[PDB]
Amino acid sequence: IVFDIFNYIGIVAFAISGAIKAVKKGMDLLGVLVLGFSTALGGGIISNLLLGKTPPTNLIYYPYPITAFLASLATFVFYRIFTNVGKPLLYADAIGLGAFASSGASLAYSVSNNVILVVIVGAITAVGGGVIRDILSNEVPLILTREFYATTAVIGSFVYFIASDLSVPEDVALIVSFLITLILRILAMELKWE
Amino acid sequence: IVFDIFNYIGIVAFAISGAIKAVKKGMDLLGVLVLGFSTALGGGIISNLLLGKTPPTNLIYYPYPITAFLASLATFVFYRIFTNVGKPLLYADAIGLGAFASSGASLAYSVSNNVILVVIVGAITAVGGGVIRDILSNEVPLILTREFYATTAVIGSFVYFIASDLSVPEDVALIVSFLITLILRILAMELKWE
Amino acid sequence: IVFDIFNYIGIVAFAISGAIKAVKKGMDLLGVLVLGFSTALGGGIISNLLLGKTPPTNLIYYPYPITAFLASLATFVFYRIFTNVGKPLLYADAIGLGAFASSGASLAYSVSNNVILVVIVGAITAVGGGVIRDILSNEVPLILTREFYATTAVIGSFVYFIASDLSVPEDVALIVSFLITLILRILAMELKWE
Ligand code: NA
Ligand code: NA
């Protein structure tokens, strides 16, 4: 059940991050929806393609794109009203990074217990939405500008792999991977490691 | 037969748009061919990947890439001679948007009657070539800069789905989806909605 | 055995090119690793997706990503020490272009003897890593800025196809395709064709 919850958490968090980016770039409602939608679902779609899972879950399981839409719309309405309140793009991205590094590693592990597949596909699941967000926004992505960003995704997917290898129950393994990924991002941002 | 015709119309229209972009960015013959080729075939390739259709039709069915090549070459020669005549990049893109939103939704519908799959894959088929064109050109894509652009693709794929759901013959369903997509773009551009 | 060697040559060469790009853009160790890793393995991953080969070889065959990592790390250490020695990004890219145009055409040919599939997938394998490198770096890719770049990849994959069609042994066919691709790039760069 933790797996199902993490999919929704990551979709909402990445939708908020993509919608925030759109608002900061001056876009209006429909363009904000496009960037939130793409950021929220891109990581899962890329991950499914790499694992040969077609059609991708994000394009068939109705609650996922509906959630991406509604979270992006809520973000637009929020900042259309409250134009001068802070825009935590990086914290929204970091929560999504933990939710998808853990859930993305879990999906890769179900295909094969190859550590390279699990760690790299999990990390691609985690950063993929934000990479799409940043490329569509015509700027250098966070995976290059933030020194510890992509490696923290790699670490979070690796701790999922290790926990699963050590027979840790899937719910616990997802939670621990999420926690380490998010804590490492919080430390990077709050301690000015980047 | 409308399906087969729309594939050629969209390939030519998107090749012209990518070749025009290349000419406006100062590229020469071979670079113009690369951008026209990529714009014309990218949407179909991405769509095939999302539906698990490999190898993609655009890389096996000879008339499609030959058409992409010849339309891109014709565009280069035209503007090499007539340097000062108008460059209708957006109208070429809009005709392709209608041809591929309709044909791309048709392909997705043949895989499954899931409305989310049909609408989103159809829209990705429609905008994908231009997104590739704009990313390769190092600028923000039309799906973000034009407020009604991506939503009009979504609308056109949705009207295909509705028409097919209502048992409208495939030729008519493709034509109506094409028409609505193109008319909505014409209205957006001519009435300064964006 | 030439096929296996070319995979390592192209991975090392593209890793060096992506790591050099990262160093020139001011990134530190971990960001240099991310760009080298992505450049070295991206072409193979895209090529596998187009041919329906999942999971991609670069994410399961341990020596490939290990080689990408080690070559990127060696490049960072080299230029961290020797900051003022030349940075042959384009020569590293050109060696990879020949190694992957040949090996990528070979992989496509094993799926089908369709000349369009072999030539275009082979060329996408050859340029894909550098296109990813350039998009992540927020600039126009070499396939658009260098007039003879993408066409030379197309030529190299085509000479592989012709040699294989003429029953030339695979080792020789790979070597000849590699040679023509690399020689054509050397001529383009040394004779100021671009
Ligand atoms: Na840019
Ligand atoms: Na860019």
Residue numbers in the entry:
A (entry chain A), B (entry chain A), C (entry chain A): 7 to 200
Sentences copied from the publication:
The structure for the wild-type protein in another lattice was solved by molecular replacement and extended to 1.6 Å resolution (type 2a, in P63 lattice). The final model for SaTRIC was refined to Rwork/Rfree values of 16.8%/17.9%, containing ordered residues 7–200, two Na+ ions and 90 water molecules. We identified these densities as water molecules on the basis of their coordination with the surrounding residues. We describe this arrangement as a ‘locked' conformation of C-THB. By contrast, interactions among the quasi-symmetric mates in N-THB, N13 (TM1)–S53-N54 (TM2)–Y70 (TM3), are mostly undone; thereby, N-THB is released to an unlocked, pore-open conformation. This asymmetry in the inverted pair of THBs, with C-THB in a locked state versus N-THB in an unlocked state, generates an open-outward conformation. The high-resolution structure clearly reveals that these glycine motifs generate similar kinks (∼41° in TM2 and ∼45° in TM5) near the middle of the respective TM segments, disrupting the normal α-helical hydrogen-bonding pattern and exposing backbone amines that coordinate bridging water molecules. Two monovalent Na+ ions, each with three bound water molecules, were bound in the 1.6 Å-resolution type 2a structure, while in the 1.9 Å-resolution type 2b structure, obtained from a different condition, a single divalent Mg2+ ion was bound at the same site, with slight adjustment on the N144 side chain and also with three bound water molecules. The well-defined series of water molecules through each protomer of the high-resolution type 2a SaTRIC structure and sensitivity of conduction properties to mutations of associated residues define a putative ion conduction pathway.
In this study, we analyse the structure and function of a bacterial and an archaeal TRIC channel. Both proteins have similar structures, consisting in symmetric trimers of 7-TM subunits, each composed as inverted quasi-repeats of triple-helix bundles (THBs) plus an added TM segment (TM7).
